[PDB]
């Protein structure tokens, strides 16, 4: 068929304070738009992390990794943070819990 396989709805990407501070330290605007395009076609494209409440990790820069939460009803993505491949790739409980907290902090801003 003509239209490519995936989702084609108006969508919103929402940078967090962290992601906005550190985005351009990592991604050229081409890389960033390619990333949002990929998620817009397919949310659920990132690998789930458990204990987080639905946060996902995508690895496309290279070794850049973004962590995001897609909001089911409002069709907004929360871009939580971006970290490089070499750098802290060690996932522990203090991390998963605080990520879940800030994620829920955005989540309950628009009921």
């Amino acid at each position, epitope marked *: 068929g*003509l239209v490519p396989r995936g989702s084609h709805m108006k969508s919103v990407f929402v940078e967090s304070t962290i992601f906005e501070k550190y985005r351009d330290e990592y991604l050229s605007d081409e890389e960033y738009r390619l990333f949002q395009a990929e998620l817009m076609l397919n949310p659920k494209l990132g690998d789930v992390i458990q204990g987080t409440g639905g946060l996902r990790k995508i690895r496309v820069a290279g070794g850049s990794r973004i962590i995001y939460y897609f909001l089911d009803e409002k069709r907004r993505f929360y871009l939580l943070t971006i970290y490089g491949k070499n750098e802290m790739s060690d996932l522990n409980a203090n991390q998963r819990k605080q990520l879940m907290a800030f994620m829920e902090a955005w989540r309950n801003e628009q009921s």
Partner: nanobody
Amino acid sequence: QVQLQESGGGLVQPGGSLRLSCVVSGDRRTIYTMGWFRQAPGNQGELVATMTSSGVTTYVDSVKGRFSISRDSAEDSAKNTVSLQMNSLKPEDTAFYTCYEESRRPLGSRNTYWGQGTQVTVSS
């Protein structure tokens, strides 16, 4: 909130012209950048064109000379309409075309808004 409604698309003869269009309204915000993306089936998509709030544009190499991005501020009160003008359409330009716009409301989030998209089929 911020409203995005887009227009244009369909289906065109080679060498013909089509204007895609895409409007962002709501109340006031600071606009950073804004562009168009395209994706044909089976392969990775490609960013078609970009324009900073300063006018700085990029275009991809395959569309150089033929597509043009332009903009309309509506006094910079209100809305900006972004237009993709496509001329001398080649069949390689057949793709699903989406627009986007980064922008930051007062005391608000740096968001990039994305369109539904629209299929553009350039077939002999």
